[PDB]
RNA sequence: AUUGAAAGUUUUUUUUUUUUUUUUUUUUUUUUUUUUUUUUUUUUUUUU
């Protein structure tokens, strides 16, 4: 069932910090998509000066 | 029934003319439409 608790404020003070996680992939294969089709150009070559197009 | 009387104090004459209640006198002098308010929270680019 659903244990319906008062919600706590956010301005009262508990505890505040930053932790720091590491992710690690066991299985050599992880793909989240981005829901892009195309190329991502990596060299990203601006060898047009001679010939441009 | 007088000594004994019968006569309008009347006719006629415009209190009128000259003269702008006028000139000058700015309903203005000052005053910030500002002032506190996070376009924010929820949602796994994803399966037979």
Known sequence: ??????????????????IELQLNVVSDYLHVGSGKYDVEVMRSVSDVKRLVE
């Open 1 to 18: 069932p659903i244990r319906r608790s008062n919600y706590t404020p956010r301005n009262e003070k508990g505890l505040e910090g930053v």
